[PDB]
Amino acid sequence: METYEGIIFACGKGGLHEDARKILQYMTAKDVVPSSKAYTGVIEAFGQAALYEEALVAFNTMHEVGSNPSIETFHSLLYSFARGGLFKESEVILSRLVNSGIPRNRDTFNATIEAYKQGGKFEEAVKTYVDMEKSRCDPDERTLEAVLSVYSCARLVDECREQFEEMKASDILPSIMCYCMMLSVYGKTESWDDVNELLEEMLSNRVSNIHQVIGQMIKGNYDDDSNWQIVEYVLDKLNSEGCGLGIRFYNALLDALWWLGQKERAARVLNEATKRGIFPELFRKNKLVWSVDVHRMSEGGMYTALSVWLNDLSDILPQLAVVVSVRGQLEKSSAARESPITRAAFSFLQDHVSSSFSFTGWNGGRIMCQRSQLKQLNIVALTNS
Amino acid sequence: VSALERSLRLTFMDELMERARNRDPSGVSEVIYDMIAAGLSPGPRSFHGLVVAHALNGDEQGAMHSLRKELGAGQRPLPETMIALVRLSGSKGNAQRGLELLAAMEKLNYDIRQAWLILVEELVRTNHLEEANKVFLKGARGGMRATDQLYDLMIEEDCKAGDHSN
Amino acid sequence: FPLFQLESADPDFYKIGYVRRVRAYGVEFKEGPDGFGIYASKDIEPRRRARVIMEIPHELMITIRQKHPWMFFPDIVPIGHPIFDIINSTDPERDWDLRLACLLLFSFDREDHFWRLYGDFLPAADECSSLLLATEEDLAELQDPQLVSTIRQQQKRVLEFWEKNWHSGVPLKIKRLAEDAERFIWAVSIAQTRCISMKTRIGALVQDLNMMIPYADMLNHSFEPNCFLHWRPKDRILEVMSNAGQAIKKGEEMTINYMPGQKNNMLMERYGFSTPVNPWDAIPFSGDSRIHLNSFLSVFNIFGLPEEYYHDFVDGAVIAAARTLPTWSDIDLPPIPSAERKAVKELQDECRKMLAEYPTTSEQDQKLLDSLSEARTTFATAVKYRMHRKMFIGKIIKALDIYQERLL
Numbered sequence: 005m006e007t008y009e010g011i012i013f014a015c016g017k018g019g020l021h022e023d024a025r026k027i028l029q030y031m032t033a034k035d036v037v038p039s040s041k042a043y044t045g046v047i048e049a050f051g052q053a054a055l056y057e058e059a060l061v062a063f064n065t066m067h068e069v070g071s072n073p074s075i076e077t078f079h080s081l082l083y084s085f086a087r088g089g090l091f092k093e094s095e096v097i098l099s100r101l102v103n104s105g106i107p108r109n110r111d112t113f114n115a116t117i118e119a120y121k122q123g124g125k126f127e128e129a130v131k132t133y134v135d136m137e138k139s140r141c142d143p144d145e146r147t148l149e150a151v152l153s154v155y156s157c158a159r160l161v162d163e164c165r166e167q168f169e170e171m172k173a174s175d176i177l178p179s180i181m182c183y184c185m186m187l188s189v190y191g192k193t194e195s196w197d198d199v200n201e202l203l204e205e206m207l208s209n210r211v212s213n214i215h216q217v218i219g220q221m222i223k224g225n226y227d228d229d230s231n232w233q234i235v236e237y238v239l240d241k242l243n244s245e246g247c248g249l250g251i252r253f254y255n256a257l258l259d260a261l262w263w264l265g266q267k268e269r270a271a272r273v274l275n276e277a278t279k280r281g282i283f284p285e286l287f288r289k290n291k292l293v294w295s296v297d298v299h300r301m302s303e304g305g306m307y308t309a310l311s312v313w314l315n316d317l318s319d320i321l322p323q324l325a326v327v328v329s330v331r332g333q334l335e336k337s338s339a340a341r342e343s344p345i346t347r348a349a350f351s352f353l354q355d356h357v358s359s360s361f362s363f364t365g366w367n368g369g370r371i372m373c374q375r376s377q378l379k380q381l382n383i384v385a386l387t388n389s
Numbered sequence: 390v391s392a393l394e395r396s397l398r399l400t401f402m403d404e405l406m407e408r409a410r411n412r413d414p415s416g417v418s419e420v421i422y423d424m425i426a427a428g429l430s431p432g433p434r435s436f437h438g439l440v441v442a443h444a445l446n447g448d449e450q451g452a453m454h455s456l457r458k459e460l461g462a463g464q465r466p467l468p469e470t471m472i473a474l475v476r477l478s479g480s481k482g483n484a485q486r487g488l489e490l491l492a493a494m495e496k497l498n499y500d501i502r503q504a505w506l507i508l509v510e511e512l513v514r515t516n517h518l519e520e521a522n523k524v525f526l527k528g529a530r531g532g533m534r535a536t537d538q539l540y541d542l543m544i545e546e547d548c549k550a551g552d553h554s555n
Numbered sequence: 556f557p558l559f560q561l562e563s564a565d566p567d568f569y570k571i572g573y574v575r576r577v578r579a580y581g582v583e584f585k586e587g588p589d590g591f592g593i594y595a596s597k598d599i600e601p602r603r604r605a606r607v608i609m610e611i612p613h614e615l616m617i618t619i620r621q622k623h624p625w626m627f628f629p630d631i632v633p634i635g636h637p638i639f640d641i642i643n644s645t646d647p648e649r650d651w652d653l654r655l656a657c658l659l660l661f662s663f664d665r666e667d668h669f670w671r672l673y674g675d676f677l678p679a680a681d682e683c684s685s686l687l688l689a690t691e692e693d694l695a696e697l698q699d700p701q702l703v704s705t706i707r708q709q710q711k712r713v714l715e716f717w718e719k720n721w722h723s724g725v726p727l728k729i730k731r732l733a734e735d736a737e738r739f740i741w742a743v744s745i746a747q748t749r750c751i752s753m754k755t756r757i758g759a760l761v762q763d764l765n766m767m768i769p770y771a772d773m774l775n776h777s778f779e780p781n782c783f784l785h786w787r788p789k790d791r792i793l794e795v796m797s798n799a800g801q802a803i804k805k806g807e808e809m810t811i812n813y814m815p816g817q818k819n820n821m822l823m824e825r826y827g828f829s830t831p832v833n834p835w836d837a838i839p840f841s842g843d844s845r846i847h848l849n850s851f852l853s854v855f856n857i858f859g860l861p862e863e864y865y866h867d868f869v870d871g872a873v874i875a876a877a878r879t880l881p882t883w884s885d886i887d888l889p890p891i892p893s894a895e896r897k898a899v900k901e902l903q904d905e906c907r908k909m910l911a912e913y914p915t916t917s918e919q920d921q922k923l924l925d926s927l928s929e930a931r932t933t934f935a936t937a938v939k940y941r942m943h944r945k946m947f948i949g950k951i952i953k954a955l956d957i958y959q960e961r962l963l
């Protein structure tokens with residue numbers, strides 16, 4: 005019992021869906037009724053790798069064996085649905101919570117916050133923020149981080165720096181997040197003076213080491229073979245709190261690097277993240293489908309992934325090269341057509357490879373390119389500013 | 390349904406049925422995820438291929454997992470899928486699992502006579518005469534009629550085993 | 556408020572039966588250009604068990620033993636009558652219709668027999684659809700040498716029997732039964748087209764009988780019938796029973812299965828008709844191209860064992876196709892679509908070749924029928940037979956196309 009739960013929790017934290025699945029089958033093969041905690045662990049393990057259907061199947065099987073859902077199971081469900089931007093599943097689970105009578109803690113509120121942020125619903129995000137402040141409870145660092153990310157995404161510099169100066173007044177040792185999307189938002193409007201004034205304080209960082217390393221390497225001082233090793237050890241050290249934090253860290257870093265003119269550095273960061281285990285759904289290569297998944301990424305992370313995906317396509321044939329802009333219930337609707345992810349990907353492909361990547365006549369959240377259009381096709385110039 | 394979508398579905402279904410025919414459920418899962426990425430909704434046919442691939446190499450838990458994916462995906466499982474599941478349960482001797490699958494078939498407005506006969510015959514073949522007798526008697530008391538060959542087989546096997554009551 | 560807001564049969568037809576203990580419940584007799592038929596005069600509510608529709612007493616029938624020796628029930632033939640000598644010389648196996656024709660003529664000559672009156676509602680020589688009355692021109696339109704040869708053999712046998720047994724020297728009581736050959740031919744045709752065979756118990760004697768049952772030959776044939784015949788031995792009554800739990804709407808025709816598991820050719824040989832939804836029709840394929848039986852059944856929702864195919868566009872034609880199409884089965888092996896498309900293309904090519912073998916098409920046959928004004932019943936029967944074969948092949952083609960469509 006203890007060994008099964010420990011292994012399953014470790015796999016879920018580390019995003020090892022396959023190992024958790026194998027443990028589940030082995031322990032079910034011995035006529036052992038699974039507990040709620042182990043089922044929650046395997047569900048959250050499946051959600052790390054964006055395997056929503058497997059997590060939903062496990063959640064459905066949870067009630068079959070008599071294991072009732074707990075608060076941790078719901079927290080994992082909201083976090084997994086929020087990472088992918090599936091806000092419809094988010095409000096469905098919220099309705100399930102409201103009809104189950106369980107009180108909503110900060111986890112539900114902030115999971116909804118980033119679920120609407122990744123889905124592009126900025127107005128609903130701020131509405132849910134004001135509702136969170138209306139009722140009760142104190143937002144943690146995660147809530148203000150999510151609102152800073154949503155403000156940076158929706159071209160709001162002024163509220164961004166207001167929240168920045170408000171949050172740093174609490175002596176909280178601001179994390180990699182805040183700096184990363186602050187560089188991103190300042191690079192949105194070519195605020196080179198603000199970027200430099202942030203970097204001047206960022207470079208020293210007498211307190212922590214991670215900030216110093218990343219601030220040195222973003223400027224290009226750590227690009228050498230020996231000078232990238234410090235970045236590699238700091239990345240390895242950071243790969244211990246879990247893939248849930250790793251995906252956010254890589255998203256923020258990629259957005260900052262892409263929006264600061266460091267396209268080659270962003271490409272190399274994405275390349276080193278792929279072998280780590282973060283973004284396991286990023287690339288699929290087979291005779292049938294050559295796909296890139298971006299529904300869990302930010303705008304900056306999408307552009308870096310698309311840039312390196314286009315370059316690999318020109319090197320080489322699959323029956324179809326597709327872009328998974330939106331994944332979830334929104335696919336069978338016109339709502340995903342207007343989504344910021346879909347329109348951003350479409351505009352990027354349109355201005356880079358001309359009118360070759362068309363939409364899908366059956367799916368509302370995919371960008372399509374037949375093999376015939378692949379036949380007629382270094383495409384994206386990756387340079388450091 | 391355009392001709393392009395039809396051709397893509399044809400190619401994907403062909404390759405998936407191939408992978409199911411070489412006893413490779415993992416490959417069928419890769420094809421299903423390829424359909425998901427491509428935007429093609431997984432219909433009952435591809436999932437039935439997955440279930441058959443799991444059942445061919447004597448894997449009951451994987452077959453039931455594929456049926457759970459059926460029900461979660463919202464698709465109506467084909468009669469062949471349920472027939473394969475009941476045949477696998479009978480081959481493994483899982484009489485209760487076969488009865489549950491028969492009840493699920495009944496709930497889905499399906500004729501369960503053929504599946505009942507297949508389950509009884511498989512249970513007899515694998516040498517599970519007690520469970521075969523129980524399933525046969527449940528079906529017969531339920532108003533279901535068996536073939537003459539099955540009646541003769543049940544009578545002869547029961548009398549050979551010395552079971553006069555059944 | 557009440558103030559603010561096919562033809563019926565001759566009443567004497569049922570009245571002569573009614574005064575002789577014939578009872579019809581919830582049904583009325585109607586007559587049309589094709590012929591007589593039985594239709595529900597109201598809405599028959601489906602009950603727990605089978606519902607009684609008609610009751611025909613045994614004394615109004617003309618029944619003969621199906622096996623040697625020949626004994627008639629009820630015994631209408633007197634001892635020493637030469638008609639018994641004529642009957643007793645027939646072949647026990649294949650000459651069953653000749654004995655029934657002899658009995659029919661004898662009954663028509665009997666003054667107190669019921670069939671002297673009921674025989675006036677039988678179809679005449681120009682209204683009967685039996686192929687025994689068809690000429691060589693009508694047989695030429697069957698487009699089937701086997702059926703034509705069988706019909707010629709039947710006609711030759713009937714005429715040989717009449718010539719052998721109705722020569723010059725026969726007594727007057729025999730000569731008046733059939734003065735000339737076509738009368739006996741019509742008698743044999745009526746016997747073939749309306750005989751009902753059953754295993755009936757009379758008292759303590761159980762035997763098979765060939766029966767000419769009035770008011771029960773009125774029912775039309777169907778391969779999915781709503782009625783069936785049950786013999787009640789205690790009072791010697793034949794019951795027409797509607798299927799248990801099967802609702803029947805007002806005006807719905809009452810139909811029984813004349814004979815199960817028989818193709819259209821044997822139906823045309825015996826009852827002189829064919830149906831386009833015959834679920835037992837056979838098309839001879841090469842067998843080189845085959846499709847998946849399980850997928851074909853599941854797409855069209857055809858369940859049950861091969862001898863009890865049934866549907867939950869799909870009709871008896873699809874069942875006949877599934878029973879006749881070249882099929883392969885490997886327990887649980889799925890079919891890869893690519894070979895299925897090629898197989899159905901080859902099968903469609905074979906079906907189109909078969910259609911091209913026929914000099915004309917089915918739509919032109921229907922147009923010829925609609926423009927027909929001076930043709931005998933057998934002419935239209937042959938035209939309908941060939942057209943029904945053409946529609947069966949076309950339905951096979953369409954079913955293959957839609958099956959290959961729904962394979963993904």
Ligand SMILES: Nc1ncnc2c1ncn2[C@@H]1O[C@H](CSCC[C@H](N)C(=O)O)[C@@H](O)[C@H]1O
Binds near residue numbers: 677683749773
């Ligand atoms: N389903 C059907 N379609 C067309 N003709 C049918 C038929 N079923 C039976 N018949 C015809 O009806 C005859 C059986 S006696 C049935 C009643 C007859 N039509 C009459 O008016 O007296 C057979 O000779 C057959 O040719």
